[PDB]
Design a protein around this ligand. Structure first.
Ligand SMILES: CCCCCCCCCCCCCCCCCC(=O)OC[C@H](COP(=O)([O-])OCC(O)COP(=O)([O-])OC[C@@H](COC(=O)CCCCCCCCCCCCCCCCC)OC(=O)CCCCCCCCCCCCCCCCC)OC(=O)CCCCCCCCCCCCCCCCC
Ligand SMILES: CCCCCCCCCCCCCCCCCC(=O)OC[C@H](COP(=O)([O-])OCC(O)COP(=O)([O-])OC[C@@H](COC(=O)CCCCCCCCCCCCCCCCC)OC(=O)CCCCCCCCCCCCCCCCC)OC(=O)CCCCCCCCCCCCCCCCC
Ligand SMILES: CCCCCCCCCCCCCCCCCC(=O)OC[C@H](COP(=O)([O-])OCC(O)COP(=O)([O-])OC[C@@H](COC(=O)CCCCCCCCCCCCCCCCC)OC(=O)CCCCCCCCCCCCCCCCC)OC(=O)CCCCCCCCCCCCCCCCC
Ligand SMILES: CCCCCCCCCCCCCCCCCC(=O)OC[C@H](COP(=O)([O-])OCC[N+](C)(C)C)OC(=O)CCCCCCCCCCCCCCCCC
Ligand SMILES: CCCCCCCCCCCCCCCCCC(=O)OC[C@H](COP(=O)([O-])OCC[N+](C)(C)C)OC(=O)CCCCCCCCCCCCCCCCC
Ligand SMILES: CCCCCCCCCCCCCCCCCC(=O)OC[C@H](COP(=O)([O-])OCC[N+](C)(C)C)OC(=O)CCCCCCCCCCCCCCCCC
Ligand SMILES: CCCCCCCCCCCCCCCCCC(=O)OC[C@H](COP(=O)([O-])OCC[N+](C)(C)C)OC(=O)CCCCCCCCCCCCCCCCC
Ligand SMILES: CCCCCCCCCCCCCCCC(=O)OC[C@H](COP(=O)(O)O)OC(=O)CCCCCCCCCCCCCCC
Ligand code: SF4
Lengths: 133, 62, 73, 283, 93, 59, 58, 64, 59, 67, 142, 102, 161, 121
């Protein structure tokens, strides 16, 4: 439907959740049910199509965001889909997407260590009390 | 196994110190649990900082 | 001319530890460069991604900014 | 090419199976070398305890003693007793060797560094241990030596005890980890090794380790004084080499299991600086 | 000035070469396992069961789409092999 | 108890503590392990290299 | 030691749960779009099956 | 602790199956080539459950 | 990598096992079975109950 | 003795706030448990079920959304 | 540290050591506190689990209490003839007391930067949650 | 018991031809409880589509991490009565075993 | 020719079987104590890679250490025959060699070589621990050389035929 | 639990054992086995074994196996509650303690009756 892979879809959604909020609310209200069992998608097809169109609109990014998007993709590749471990890079991507004009100064105020290749190896660097959930 | 006065005194002091040590350990565990409660409260405040919106269930659910 | 016994023992310990430590830290021996190249290839490009029309900075401007800042080294 | 390509769809995959076989062979050979080195270490450590040089002339300063003994065990000839069952006498050691060389699959060397993505590592270990005990009992039975049969009965008793002992240990351990996978233990053991919780039952943990390793005071099956040799009193050459290799494989891998589940696995002993450490870093 | 080793350390050092050989073999075995499991995935992928439900769904969505959804939606009556050597159901019954 | 199979008229909690120490925390695997494995290994080996050295003899 | 170690393990578990709250929040943010894509694909397959069934049974 | 005399001893009654050896006892040749035996002891041992019952020592293997 | 420290610990435990084999005597099967089923099973179960109680207290 | 101690402590934990009361006396179970346990339970009478958040209306902080 | 920062998984994936960034972030928050020091209304709404006076007293008293306990322990059970083990155990007790006190102080800091999260501006909140100080350029003089 | 492995000299052919072969034939002829279950390959796999469906809302609301959830919900929540009955049964069985030994 | 491969493999086999030379745990008389003395630390046997095995099936050397009596000769023959090949026999002590102090006895066999083929003899009564060590090392050297003692003749191309 | 990789690894382990089989066969070239009367007979410490294949043992500790059969299942019943003890409630806690108490009482009864030790027959 998107021709986009799962982790990239998650990264894009972390920002798109704030631009198509009304469509997301409409979809959620349509799918609401009195039991945990899911509702038939045939009823929510229209809201789903609206949400997907807005997501197509939102997926576009400025070129200045490309480095942040790539590092977030690398993080989400090395970690098997753990959003929490890579939220910092996803947060940087969201910040660049929102008001990309200020991201120029954001990058300008960068330290030597930050201006370096970002390689992720979670086996070597597990972290602190990582539950993987 | 008759015991001398010195050995009996040492045994008695060992028992008393063991009792005090156990009581202190239980008290510290109680304090540690209270500390965990405080940390949970702090983190709940932090998380709820921005998650303040509650959406009512639609009327069609019933 | 003589050296302390602990100095000699430390020399032996280093002889054992430095190679073992390096080998453990680099299990993919001599293919680390290939791994770097594969990571570079995985990294996406402007053409691969789709960009907004009202971009604050053009692709050329972004490239010039990255070159000036030395973003990747 | 269009009409010829279909003929090779299944022919171009055999090299992949060959590569898989080669990698498995390499892993098995490497673990065999590790176990041989473990045997040499055992001889040298016992030599230190007994104040003797130990292997020193098979290879310069005894560097190839394990290689020499393995080659000699290969060289030694074998004969099956006439009264014994020819088929089973050879079938049992073959199954034992297969099981022992399958042991290494249930091993982890990192957060997810395992040959296979197994979750029920403890279940696998229990099943493999039960199979090896089966092989030992069958060895003792089919070698009609009375000493071997008594060794098999002793092995049965040891297995009976191990069931409850290891089951209770695993029950206590899973209560924290909540999983059978070895990885889940290390994440909890990062701050403090899990042995601190069990410090009171440290003696029982030592007993469990020795009992599962079949080391003293639990070397009843292979007791060389009470029984001639044990379950292998009528086996020589590589048939007995297989049993020895299996015993050392079990020792090595259960040592790994204990280290992972109770001593932090691949986490350094950070508890030695617990007082000086800080639990958070906020800028 | 006989700067010889202490007696206890000299006695202990006898068994050290065995330790060194054991470390060599153990590092070889561990590195072989690491490389064998690392090459196919280009990484040390976390175990599937060591992940949340949502993470599992996100990880396996692409595989499901590539293996089942596309053949299902491009299915034709004459695509199936007459020998009944078709792909097995995702949830085998 | 030292003189025969009989037992004292009045047992004390010292016996309880000793039995608890011996059973709950098995001291063998630590006491003896240390005392022998770790300590006795610090003594020089008693071996005589026969090919290049000979044992003491007398005329 | 047993009591203190159990307390420490519970502390670790509760810290993990604290972080799981944020992970769940991120997953919630990402949920609607993947759900929409999955629903659209599911409905496309259902439409194909409905067309086939109607043609075969009519 | 309760009594265990009946579980600890089994007498033999005349012409009684229950009070008799209902098992084929293990007649082992403990030694001479046995690590525990000093080397010249041929002890015929009657084991029943790995518990010695009957001893028949032969000690002439070192008569000189 | 983690397997470096893991191999170190495995070597330590192997040396411990070897030293224990060189030091300690050997048990009887009946003696160990009686000890286990009379003392150690109860010890394990009591330890499990204590852990359950402590976890309930802390949670 | 440990059981008595923990039970006494649990009954004394009523002083703390609701989320920190003893789980022995207060239930905290997954959504699958709670829904089936309190579906038509007039004793608890939690109310309607929030499908996309998996909780009842009357449970504290059932629907917690961003912004 | 045992747990690292509560906002993010510290040293997860790539390990980052940026003392310059840490100093800039600390300076930014110091400037924020100094700027809002005079605001009585702002100071009124600051909340913490444990009072600053209480945590300071605990920090400066726990090591002393530990040292006193160690002194009592060595007097009761240790032979005065020797001194190495007595010094070691006394230092261990003092370090245990210091551990308790330092934990009190660190938990106070955690509470200070968590309970008062809503009082910070958006840029400072982002800078605190993430490891980068680039979100708060204005605060550290750039 | 039966260490040597020697067993009774039994000929199964007599009963096989007298009672068991015909009775089995009749039972197989007249026995089928499977009502309408369909084999795999009965229809093309491409017609089945439900297995691809994923519920992401339920996924992120789900916190379970082990496959013992149904077992605990059964033994300790729903079928706890049978759980206690099994415990009492095992206790009484141990008593019966001891008495049989005596 | 096979010799190209056989000869180096012969050397490897001889080296391996020399390095791992496990005798049988079998002692009959005072000579047993001397064997134990060689096994223990002062003259460590393990240095030369000899470790004793209880079962004959796992033994390479038969240490006939002690007097052999008529009441035991069938047992010695059975043990020798049951020991897995290849194997060697070492007589230790005067009693094992030729009857020793009891050569004029009515119960003692005048030599274990009458019942068994003896590969090597170690004189002594008792042989010293170093004497037993010397005998074992000489037996090991002879064993290593036994594989190729220059039996086959070299042709014009220096290849054995 | 694994996948078909486990079966393929079993096959690979058998292929690996074929290597040791080849080595053992090749070793045959460096020794000759003579035919002797007692070379292929049961070993009984240097004398002929009187009995073979009638080697019945006495199973006088069968109560331990009998009780193991029950206690294995009793312990197995505890796994789900231990795994999901974070979900424990009043009922689950009561049931777990009830079950553990039943196990303890059964063990105590066994000890009282003295069936955990070797008997005359
Ligand atoms: C085409 C490619 C070309 C590439 C370039 C060219 C090739 C480069 C290759 C470089 C590496 C080759 C190997 C070098 C070996 C050097 C040995 C040496 O120094 O000679 C002295 C040494 C003297 O030993 P010895 O005569 O037996 O000892 C006499 C007495 O025992 C008295 O003992 P002592 O007083 O002498 O003390 C002994 C010990 C004392 O030292 C110590 O104590 C420290 C070590 C022990 C630590 C123990 C930790 C556990 C503690 C447990 C508890 C406490 C202990 C006590 C416990 C009991 C207490 C009661 O000191 C040592 O022997 C240290 C030597 C360390 C050598 C190992 C180095 C590598 C190890 C890691 C693997 C490397 C993989 C490749 C990496 C490549 C990239 C870099 O020579 C030896 O005999 C070697 C002994 C060690 C075994 C080495 C086995 C090597 C096998 C071949 C490996 C091939 C694969 C790897 C290379 C692949 C190509 C890159
Ligand atoms: C004499 C006359 C001439 C005869 C000629 C005979 C015929 C010659 C060949 C003719 C045909 C040539 C065709 C060429 C074109 C086609 C090539 C092709 O199809 O491949 C493309 C295919 C895919 O293309 P690609 O994706 O572009 O490839 C890039 C990489 O795959 C990307 O890699 P990555 O970044 O994903 O990192 C993962 C990679 C990176 O991992 C590595 O391969 C790097 C090295 C890993 C550690 C190795 C440690 C070795 C030492 C450990 C300690 C041993 C101690 C005990 C033994 C004693 C040692 C002295 O590892 C793997 O992918 C898994 C491979 C695991 C290999 C198994 C372990 C190798 C050692 C075996 C030891 C066996 C037991 C001991 C035997 C002792 C004998 C005395 O590439 C591969 O799959 C590469 C496989 C490489 C396997 C290892 C090869 C040897 C490496 C150097 C170590 C040699 C050690 C020798 C020791 C000797 C002792 C005496
Ligand atoms: C978070 C969890 C943490 C763990 C929790 C665990 C909880 C368990 C609870 C249950 C158990 C409780 C046990 C309580 C025990 C105390 C009870 C008590 O108070 O009873 C009073 C009881 C009654 O005694 P008393 O009648 O008053 O008589 C006093 C004694 O005569 C004694 O007379 P003295 O005082 O004149 O002489 C004794 C003194 C002698 O001391 C000395 O001589 C000074 C040190 C000499 C060191 C020698 C080695 C140096 C090596 C240098 C190597 C250089 C290499 C260079 C080249 C390298 C090349 C690579 O020994 C010491 O006190 C040693 C203490 C210092 C150890 C070293 C520093 C460790 C620092 C650890 C990190 C701390 C960081 C802070 C945070 C910690 C957080 C946990 O006290 C005793 O029985 C004292 C026993 C002392 C034994 C000391 C043993 C030391 C370790 C020996 C290791 C040997 C290894 C050999 C090699 C092995 C190779 C495999
Ligand atoms: C799986 C392997 C086992 C793991 C076990 C878990 C770790 C436990 C560590 C030890 C904690 C203390 C337990 C109690 C010790 C009681 C000792 C004692 O009896 O003292 C009095 C004993 C004797 O006093 P006694 O009074 O008991 O008996 C003597 C009797 N009279 C008085 C008559 C003479 O004194 C000692 O010598 C004690 C020395 C203890 C030293 C212990 C060292 C253990 C080292 C190995 C431990 C495992 C390390 C693993 C490392 C892994 C790293 C990855
Ligand atoms: C592999 C086996 C390793 C075995 C090592 C054995 C070595 C020999 C024994 C060395 C003992 C050294 C003394 C300190 C040992 C650590 C004590 C401990 O657990 O404190 C951590 C604890 C740390 O707990 P904490 O994690 O709450 O610390 C504060 C936490 N924050 C930061 C969140 C606030 O230390 C203390 O807090 C002080 C004591 C508090 C009261 C409760 C303590 C219960 C356990 C006491 C055991 C005491 C045993 C020794 C008795 C005295 C012997 C002289
Ligand atoms: C040349 C003559 C050939 C004669 C025939 C050969 C007979 C071979 C008999 C043994 C192998 C049988 C293979 C077919 C059954 C495969 C079952 C299966 O699906 O498992 C994979 C399944 C994989 O399922 P999955 O969960 O990955 O799901 C697959 C998903 N789809 C359908 C989409 C592909 O295994 C598992 O799920 C769990 C792992 C099980 C691992 C079992 C390990 C022990 C196996 C011991 C076998 C011992 C055999 C030899 C000795 C006994 C006598 C036979
Ligand atoms: C991936 C890594 C793979 C590494 C593999 C490494 C393993 C190498 C294994 C080598 C095995 C060598 C076997 C030699 C056998 C001949 C010698 C012998 O046994 O002598 C006794 C008997 C002969 O005894 P004899 O009567 O001559 O007596 C010899 C004694 N003297 C010298 C005193 C007279 O063997 C024979 O019968 C010889 C003739 C028939 C065999 C001829 C050779 C056949 C080779 C088959 C190779 C099969 C390869 C399979 C590959 C696929 C496996 C899956
Ligand atoms: C699980 C492994 C780790 C151990 C964990 C459990 C530890 C249990 C003991 C904690 C300390 C108890 C202090 C009691 C002080 C006291 O009152 O002390 C009073 C007297 C003091 O006697 P003294 O004058 O000799 O000092 O001691 C006693 O009465 C002894 C009580 C029994 C202690 C035995 C050891 C514990 C066994 C398990 C508990 C069941 C005891 C049943 C006794 C009939
Ligand atoms: S030779 Fe001498 S020492 Fe040896 S057994 Fe005969 S009498 Fe004893």
């Amino acid at each position: 439907k998107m021709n986009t892979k799962s982790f990239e879809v998650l990264i894009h959604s972390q920002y798109a959740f704030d631009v198509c909020r009304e469509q997301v609310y409409n979809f959620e209200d349509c799918r609401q049910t009195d039991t945990p069992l899911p509702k038939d998608p045939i009823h929510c097809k229209a809201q789903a199509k609206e949400v997907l169109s807005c997501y197509k609109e939102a997926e576009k990014m400025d070129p200045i965001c490309l480095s942040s998007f790539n590092d977030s993709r690398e993080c989400m590749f090395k970690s098997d889909g753990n959003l929490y471990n890579c939220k910092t890079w996803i947060n940087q991507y969201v910040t660049c997407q929102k008001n990309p004009a200020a991201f120029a100064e954001f990058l300008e105020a960068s330290t030597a260590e930050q201006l370096k290749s970002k390689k992720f190896d979670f086996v070597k660097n597990r972290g602190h009390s990582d539950k993987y959930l | 196994l008759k015991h001398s006065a010195t050995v009996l005194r040492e045994i008695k002091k060992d028992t008393i110190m063991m009792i005090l040590f156990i009581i202190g350990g239980f008290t510290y565990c109680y304090h540690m649990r209270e500390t965990r409660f405080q940390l949970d409260d702090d983190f709940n405040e932090y998380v709820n900082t921005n998650k303040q919106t509650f959406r009512p269930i639609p009327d069609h659910v019933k | 001319m003589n050296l302390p016994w602990f100095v000699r023992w430390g020399t032996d310990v280093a002889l054992f530890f430095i190679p073992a430590y390096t080998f453990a830290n680099y299990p993919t021996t001599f293919f680390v460069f290939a791994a770097e190249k594969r990571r570079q290839r995985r990294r996406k490009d402007f053409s691969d991604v789709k960009l907004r029309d009202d971009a604050a900075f053009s692709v050329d401007q972004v490239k010039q900014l990255q070159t000036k800042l030395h973003l990747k080294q | 090419g269009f009409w010829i390509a279909p003929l090779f769809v299944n022919i171009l995959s055999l090299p992949l199976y060959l590569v898989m076989l080669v990698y498995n062979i390499v892993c098995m050979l490497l673990i065999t070398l590790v176990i041989a080195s473990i045997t040499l270490i055992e001889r040298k450590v016992l030599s230190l305890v007994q104040r003797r040089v130990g292997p020193h002339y098979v290879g310069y300063r005894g560097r190839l003693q394990y290689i020499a003994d393995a080659l000699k065990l290969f060289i030694k000839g074998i004969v099956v007793p006439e009264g014994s069952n020819k088929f089973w006498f050879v079938a049992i050691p073959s199954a034992a060797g297969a099981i022992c060389y399958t042991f290494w699959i249930n091993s982890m060397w990192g957060p997810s560094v395992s040959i296979f993505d197994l979750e029920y590592n403890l279940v696998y270990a229990t099943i493999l241990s039960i199979l090896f005990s089966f092989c030992i009992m069958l060895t003792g039975y089919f070698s009609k030596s009375k000493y071997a049969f008594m060794a098999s009965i002793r092995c049965a008793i040891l297995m009976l005890n191990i069931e409850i002992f290891l089951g209770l240990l695993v029950i206590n351990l899973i209560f924290i980890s909540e999983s059978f996978c070895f990885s889940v233990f290390v994440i909890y053991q990062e701050i403090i090794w899990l042995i601190f919780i069990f410090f009171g039952v440290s003696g029982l943990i030592f007993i469990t380790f020795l009992l599962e390793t079949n080391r003293a005071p639990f070397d009843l099956a292979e007791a060389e004084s009470e029984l001639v040799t044990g379950y292998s009193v009528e086996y020589g050459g590589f048939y007995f080499a297989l049993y020895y290799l299996g015993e050392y494989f079990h020792l090595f891998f259960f040592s790994m299991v204990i280290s992972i589940v109770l001593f932090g696995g691949w986490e350094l002993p950070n508890f030695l600086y617990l007082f000086l450490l800080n639990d958070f870093n906020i800028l | 000035v006989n700067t010889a080793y202490p007696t206890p350390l000299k006695t202990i050092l006898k068994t050290t070469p065995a330790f060194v050989v054991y470390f060599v073999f153990g590092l070889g075995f561990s590195t072989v396992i690491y490389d064998v499991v690392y090459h196919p995935k280009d990484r040390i992928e976390r175990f599937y069961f060591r992940s949340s439900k949502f993470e599992r769904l996100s990880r396996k969505r692409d595989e499901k789409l590539r293996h089942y959804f596309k053949p299902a939606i491009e299915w034709q009556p004459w695509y199936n092999t007459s020998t009944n050597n078709n792909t097995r159901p995702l949830l085998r019954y | 108890r030292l003189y025969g199979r009989d037992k004292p008229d009045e047992l004390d909690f010292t016996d309880v503590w000793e039995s608890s120490y011996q059973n709950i925390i098995c001291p063998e695997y630590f006491y003896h392990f240390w005392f022998c494995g770790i300590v006795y290994s610090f003594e020089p080996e008693w071996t005589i290299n026969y090919p290049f050295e000979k044992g003491p003899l007398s005329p | 030691l047993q009591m203190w170690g159990v307390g420490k393990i519970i502390e670790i578990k509760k810290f993990m749960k604290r972080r799981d709250i944020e992970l769940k929040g991120l997953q919630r943010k990402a949920a609607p779009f993947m759900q929409s894509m999955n629903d659209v694909r599911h409905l496309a397959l259902r439409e194909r099956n409905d067309m086939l069934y109607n043609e075969l049974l009519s | 602790m309760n009594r265990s005399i009946f579980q600890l001893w089994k007498p033999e009654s005349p012409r009684s199956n229950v009070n008799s050896k209902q098992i084929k006892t293990m007649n082992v040749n403990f030694g001479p080539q046995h690590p525990a035996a000093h080397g010249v002891l041929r002890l015929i041992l009657q084991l029943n459950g790995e518990i010695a019952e009957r001893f028949d020592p032969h000690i002439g293997l070192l008569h000189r | 990598m983690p397997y470096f420290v893991l191999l170190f610990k495995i070597l330590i435990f192997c040396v411990v096992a070897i030293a224990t084999r060189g030091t300690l005597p050997r048990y009887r099967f009946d003696q160990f079975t009686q000890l286990n089923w009379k003392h150690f099973i109860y010890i394990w179960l009591g330890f499990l109950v204590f852990n359950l109680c402590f976890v309930t207290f802390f949670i | 003795f440990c059981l008595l101690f923990v039970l006494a402590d649990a009954w004394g934990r009523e002083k703390y706030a609701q989320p920190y009361k003893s789980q022995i006396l207060h239930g905290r179970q997954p959504f699958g448990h709670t829904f089936v346990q309190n579906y038509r339970n007039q004793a608890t009478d939690l109310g309607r079920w929030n499908h996309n958040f998996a909780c009842y209306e009357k449970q504290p902080g059932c629907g917690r959304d961003f912004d | 540290t045992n747990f690292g920062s509560p906002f993010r998984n510290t040293d997860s994936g790539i390990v980052i050591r940026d003392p310059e960034n840490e100093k800039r972030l600390k300076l930014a928050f110091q400037n924020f506190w100094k700027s809002k020091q005079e605001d009585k209304e702002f100071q009124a709404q600051i909340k913490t689990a444990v009072s600053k006076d209480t945590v300071n007293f605990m920090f400066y008293a726990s090591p002393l209490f530990g040292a006193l306990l160690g002194k009592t322990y060595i007097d009761m059970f240790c032979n005065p003839r020797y001194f190495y083990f007595r010094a070691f155990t006394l230092s261990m007790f003092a370090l245990a007391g210091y551990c308790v006190g330092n934990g009190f102080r660190n938990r106070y800091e955690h509470s200070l930067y968590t309970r008062n999260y809503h009082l910070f501006p958006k840029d400072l909140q982002d800078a605190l949650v993430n490891g980068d100080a680039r979100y708060c350029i204005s605060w550290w003089k750039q | 018991l039966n260490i040597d492995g020697l067993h009774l000299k039994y000929n199964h052919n007599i009963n096989n031809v007298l009672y068991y072969t015909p009775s089995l034939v009749l039972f197989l002829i007249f026995f089928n409880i499977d009502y309408f279950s369909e084999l795999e390959l009965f229809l093309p796999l491409e017609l089945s589509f439900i297995d691809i469906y994923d519920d992401y809302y339920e996924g992120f609301n789900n916190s379970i991490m082990n496959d013992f959830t149904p077992l605990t919900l059964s033994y300790y929540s729903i079928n706890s009565a049978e759980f206690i009955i099994i415990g009492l049964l095992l206790l009484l069985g141990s008593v019966a075993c001891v008495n049989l030994y005596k | 020719r096979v010799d190209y491969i056989v000869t180096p493999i012969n050397a490897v086999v001889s080296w391996a079987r020399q390095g791992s030379f496990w005798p049988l745990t079998f002692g009959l008389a005072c000579c047993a104590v001397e064997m134990m003395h060689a096994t223990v630390s002062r003259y460590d046997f393990d240095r030369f890679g000899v470790i004793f095995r209880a079962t004959p099936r796992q033994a390479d050397l038969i240490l006939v250490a002690g007097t052999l009596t008529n009441k035991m000769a069938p047992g010695l023959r059975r043990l020798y025959e049951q020991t897995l090949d290849p194997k060697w026999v070492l007589s230790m002590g005067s009693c094992a060699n030729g009857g020793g102090y009891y050569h004029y006895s009515y119960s003692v066999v005048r030599g274990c070589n009458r019942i068994i083929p003896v590969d090597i003899y170690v004189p002594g009564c008792p042989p010293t621990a170093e004497a037993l060590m010397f005998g074992v090392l000489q037996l090991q050297k002879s064993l290593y050389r036994q594989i190729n003692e220059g039996e086959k003749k070299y042709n014009k191309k220096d290849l054995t035929y | 639990m694994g996948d078909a990789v486990v079966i393929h690894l079993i096959q690979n382990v058998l292929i690996f054992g074929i290597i040791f089989w080849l080595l053992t066969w090749g070793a045959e070239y460096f020794y000759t086995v003579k035919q002797q009367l007692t070379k292929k007979q049961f070993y009984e410490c240097g004398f002929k074994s009187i009995s073979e294949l009638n080697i019945q043992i006495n199973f006088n500790f069968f109560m331990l196996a009998v009780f193991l059969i029950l206690y294995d299942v009793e312990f197995t019943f505890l796994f789900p509650v231990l795994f999901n003890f974070s979900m424990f409630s009043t009922t689950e806690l009561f049931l777990a303690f009830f079950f553990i108490f039943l196990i303890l009482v059964s063990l105590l009864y066994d000890w009282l009756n003295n069936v955990l030790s070797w008997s005359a027959e």
